[PDB]
Amino acid sequence: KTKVRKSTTFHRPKTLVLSRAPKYPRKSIPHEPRLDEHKIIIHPLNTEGALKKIEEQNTLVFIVDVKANKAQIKQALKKLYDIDTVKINTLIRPDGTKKAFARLTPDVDALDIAATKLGLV
Amino acid sequence: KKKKKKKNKKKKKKPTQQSDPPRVLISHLFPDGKYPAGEEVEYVNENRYRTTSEEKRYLDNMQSEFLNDYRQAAEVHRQVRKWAQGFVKPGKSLIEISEGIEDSVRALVGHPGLEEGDALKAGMGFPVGLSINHCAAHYNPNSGNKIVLQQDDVIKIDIGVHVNGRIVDSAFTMAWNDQFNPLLEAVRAATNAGIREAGIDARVGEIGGVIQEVMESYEVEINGKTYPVKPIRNLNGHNILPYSIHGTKSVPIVKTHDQTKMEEGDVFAIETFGSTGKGYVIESGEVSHYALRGDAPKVDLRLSSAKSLLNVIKRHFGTLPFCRRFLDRLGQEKYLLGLNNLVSNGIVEDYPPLVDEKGSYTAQFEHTILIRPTVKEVISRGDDY
Amino acid sequence: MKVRPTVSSSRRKARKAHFSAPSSVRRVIMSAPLSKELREKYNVRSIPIRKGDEVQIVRGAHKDKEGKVTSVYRLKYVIHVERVTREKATGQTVPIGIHPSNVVITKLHLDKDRENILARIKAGREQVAKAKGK
Amino acid sequence: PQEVSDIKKFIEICRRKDASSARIKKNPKTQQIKFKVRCQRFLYTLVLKDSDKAEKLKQSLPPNLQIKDVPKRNKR
Amino acid sequence: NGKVKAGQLWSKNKEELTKILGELKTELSQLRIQKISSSGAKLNKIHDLRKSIARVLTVINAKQRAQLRLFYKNKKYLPLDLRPKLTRALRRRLSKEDASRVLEKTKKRLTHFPQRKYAVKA
Amino acid sequence: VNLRTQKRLAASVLGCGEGKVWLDPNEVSEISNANSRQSIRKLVADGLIIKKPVTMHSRSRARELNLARRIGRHRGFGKRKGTADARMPQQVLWMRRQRVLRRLLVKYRASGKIDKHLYHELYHLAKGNTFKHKRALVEHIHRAKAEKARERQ
RNA sequence: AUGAAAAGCACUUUGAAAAGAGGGUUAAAUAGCACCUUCAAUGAGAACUUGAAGUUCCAUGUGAACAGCGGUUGGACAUGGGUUGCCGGUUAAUAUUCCGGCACCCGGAAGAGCCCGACACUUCUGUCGGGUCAAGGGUUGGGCACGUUGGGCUUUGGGCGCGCCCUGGGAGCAGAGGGCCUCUAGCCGGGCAACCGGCCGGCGGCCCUCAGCACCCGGGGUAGCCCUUAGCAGGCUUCGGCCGUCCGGCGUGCGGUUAACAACCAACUU
RNA sequence: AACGCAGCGAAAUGCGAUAAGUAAUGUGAAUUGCAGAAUUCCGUGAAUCAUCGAAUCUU
């Protein structure tokens, strides 16, 4: 009078899982997007090495937040300076901050960008 | 013998008068090649014998060329300062004043200052000074400046001209509100007092001490409140050397025990500063003035931008002070990075504007004096100051 | 003698509260007596001193010296009036700090709030008088 | 680096859209002319001996392709 | 330009508050670039700009919080941050009505035999 | 004048050690302000910085002794310090002889000088230390073939 | 725990400096914030600095302390900077991480690096030439005939040239001589001057004649390459014929007895 | 507990990317080592002042 069972092992029956439908938000409003472009980029670096990079390798050396990754650095420079980058190489300095070398696209000249974008003027 | 064509070539009369703005070569206005002497004053007291000494007169004649071209430089200064005294008014822009001054100087000396070597033969000895209100010195508008002088501005006009590295540096102040007028007389007296006190064997601390009695003996009424005139202690006059505006000896404007003597053959800049404030100025504001140091560190520059710019400065300006616009007119495009690197290294000192406290008013007058073997020559004296 | 329980008559606590008093409290401590002309004009015996009013010195080596206060320097419990200076070795003049209790206020700095302060002190003094004179 | 042995294949390799640049290398000590074209993935080299055949090839490939002569002592 | 007064901020809509916040952040960026090697009057503005941004953010935040409390009026379950916070103990404490409840029998005793206002002579 | 930095920089650019760098004593002033690889490199071109040649170390005497040994001049008993096996192992002497004998037998079989039956017999004879060297093996082969030829009956 | 108040020491002078002596502030300073060798260079000073000869990392500075002697030196002090699947390069300090190339016998690749040179070069900057391939062992050579494969080379025949040299046009450029007119400078006569006449320098735009370099268009000849036929590009002779005196290999009788012989190449070991 | 934040700070104190703090209320001219502001009070109001009912609150 009961359904046949091809196996001697009993398995827990499948029951539906209802999605959460809270009657009140546990947090009233979502947080503002943390670590936006102004928080990411702090200030360019004016040092002999950093300026040497600008003239020769067409790269700009920036000091960014230590908790930002290369994807955020690339987006920050594009939406704040309208400068494109072929690649970005980042290191964390012994003082605890992040140094980001941003090589610009060959179409633009970095030295001009430093003047126009007030990097050094 | 070949009889070739000889079309009539009308001898043009040399011009005898100047234009507005000045563009006539100075040699056209002095066809005999002799330029006016400045104000001649005998030395005082135990030095009066110097006037008639036969040996010193011949010694002076050995440097006749030094004397006569400098006299040319001083005469150019007088005509340019006359134009400036007639032109500057509330409502004039600093940019157009500076361009007019440089063009007049360059036209009169015959040196456009574009070709290599040309600025080192003759022309501006240092960037013009256009210092407003609390700025005492070393302000110059850079390219694109839009500032216009207003009724309540106090403007200092400091003009330097050199010929063959002999630089005439003289400066004066203008104001248009009569409450500001007394300041000019106070500083004028100290400059004129310096002229009376200057001479061979005079001790510089006495000049500084005399300046102190005169400045605190003057007062000025401004907006219902009275301020004594104070010397700006931390400014000083100086000796002049070939192609170098500042030498190693100073003539203070406060008392000292300094036993440095003025000597035969020297040239001195007698400058005075007055202030209603504390009597000392600090550096503040956007920097426009620069000068290559004579005691320049011979660092092996690491930046190629710097490697060029430095040579360009030496070739075009040498040790004479320059300004940014003097670079723009050479065609260097973007060059600040090399310039700022050179400043940071310390090869080329940047001269920022110098200001006393906010709300104060300062005045400035300056003359160059030549310490000739017989008498003192206040070569830059004119009817204005 | 002290009666109210909240009042403390301990030297150590009084010295601590005075020397470590904040800026707002130090203004009340640094009070000066009014001149007899202003005392009879405003019916006020003393006021918290302010930068901007002339002052006469009655105690010290600078007695009978009149001048306006240039700085109310609360950290050191001193004020600086004009023309009281001391030359350093260099000859530079430094202002001399005078305690507000050794001076008298001959002229006031007249502001909109000082009118309220003077009105509050005046109204209180005669108001007390009517209650005590009953 | 790969070689193109046949001439005909070399032009087609120079004709495909990802051929950024090309160059001619001269070896006078052996009379070898090396035609190298750079594509997206590989650098293809074709070694030639007869200079007579070399001149025909240079004007046969599409003109859009930039060709250089590989000067001695290429500056850094 | 100058320091932004908190008084005028309170009378601005949200979208105008957002626009001014962007300008303030942008100005702080380039002004923080120039800080390298320079001492003087330049610095005072970046300190003021930092505090100016803070004032705008609080105004945006405060006006947002006020709107939420208006929407969640007459609502059984409020968000955790909008709910009153006193202490853990005070929130678990019995409600005023619950702690003051009485039984039927206790209510009957108090209705008929409460504490009387009596005086005894001498 | 402190030129320690210049000496280190010169060695790196010159691609040599620091003990080979020569700095002109009479131009210590121009070397003093080099303070960079480019300037050090410039002083190399101008002849101010020179790399000293390596110290002479010649194998001429080693070559002379080796030649004298090839003719037997320094091979005496007093010139040997190890055992004969260390100097010349028997295992490599045996391995040399075995390959020499086996190689000789292989080409003889291919050329038809011997058949497989004589080749097999000689192969195990060689493995059994019967022939001292190559000459012994051929001498044995010649004698055996003559006797095999001799049986014409 | 200085002093009521920093008024905490101006200025002169000795000393490399630290500091000292005057002088000044204070009521008081008997209250002073301690209340291996030689030479040379650098430097006040050189045994232990440098050259030549025999976060400690990097640069610049440096009073004390430390470096159990000294110290100009330093892993010390002060202030700045430095850490981003192969080859080459790049920095004062990072590189398989940066830059360039290229990826996941020949191409890469000689264009790279390394040696030699020549001229320039204050520095911004190097440029161009040349090279950079007594015993103990091996490897070859097996022939004569025939047939077959590469044909190594050459002759004839066929196809494709333009390397050079001869002839026509042009393009761009360089220099010497003559003509047109414009700007600046020196000498003579005259002229109050202005201005009028003669000689001379720099001109200096344009036109005509002479010499040299590089580029394009159109007509002639090769001198190189590729393909076939014949010989192997051959020598001797009866002049018929014979040898294949070309190289290389592969297949069938051999012969294998003196290859047990020659030549060539090689280390070592009693 | 860790890490950051000041015009010039290493520690302490204070604060949390709104960082030597913000808002709001009170009071009513300062802070102080050098810098640097504000009312110019009729709204607009220093300071590390007091109060503090609104917020931010990094790992």
Residue numbers in the entry:
A (entry chain LX): 36 to 156
B (entry chain A): 60 to 444
C (entry chain LY): 1 to 134
D (entry chain Lk): 2 to 77
E (entry chain Lh): 4 to 125
F (entry chain LR): 2 to 154
Q: What do the paper's sentences say?
A:
While this crucial step in protein maturation is executed by two types of methionine aminopeptidases in eukaryotes (MAP1 and MAP2), additional roles in disease and translational regulation have drawn more attention to MAP2. While MAP1 and MAP2 share the common pita-bread fold, the latter is additionally characterized by the presence of several insertions and a charged N-terminal extension, which consists of segmented regions of alternating poly-acidic and poly-basic stretches. However, the major determinant for binding to the tunnel exit is the MAP2-specific insert domain of ~60 residues, which is locked in between uL23, the universal binding site for nascent chain associated factors, eL19, and 28S rRNA helices H53 and H59 (also termed ES24L). Taken together, our data show that it is the insert domain that specifically directs MAP2 to the site of action on the 80S ribosome, either the PTE or the A-site.
While HsMAP2 binds in a single, rigid conformation on translationally inactive ribosomes, CtMAP2 binding is highly dynamic in the presence of random nascent chains. In contrast, CtMAP2 binding exhibited large conformational heterogeneity to the point where only parts of the insert domain could be resolved upon 3D-refinement. By performing focused 3D variability analysis, the large dataset could be separated into more homogenous subsets of particles to obtain well-defined 3D refinements. Only parts of the insert domain closest to the apical Arg361 were well resolved by the overall refinement, indicating that this residue serves as a stable pivot point around which MAP2 can rotate at the tunnel exit. Measuring the angle of rotation between Arg361 and His316 in the two extreme rotational states of MAP2, a maximum of 15° rotation was determined, which is due to constraints given by the sliding of the MAP2 insert domain over the uL23 surface. Here, MAP2 Leu396 translates by 5 Å towards uL23 Leu146, and a more extensive displacement would result in a steric clash. For CtMAP2, the trajectory of the N-terminus passes perfectly through a widened major grove of ES27L, which was well defined in the local refinement. In our reconstruction, the highly flexible ES27L was best resolved in the conformation closest to the tunnel exit, where it is stabilized by interactions with the MAP2 N-terminal extension, and at an internal RNA bulge by contacts with protein eL38.
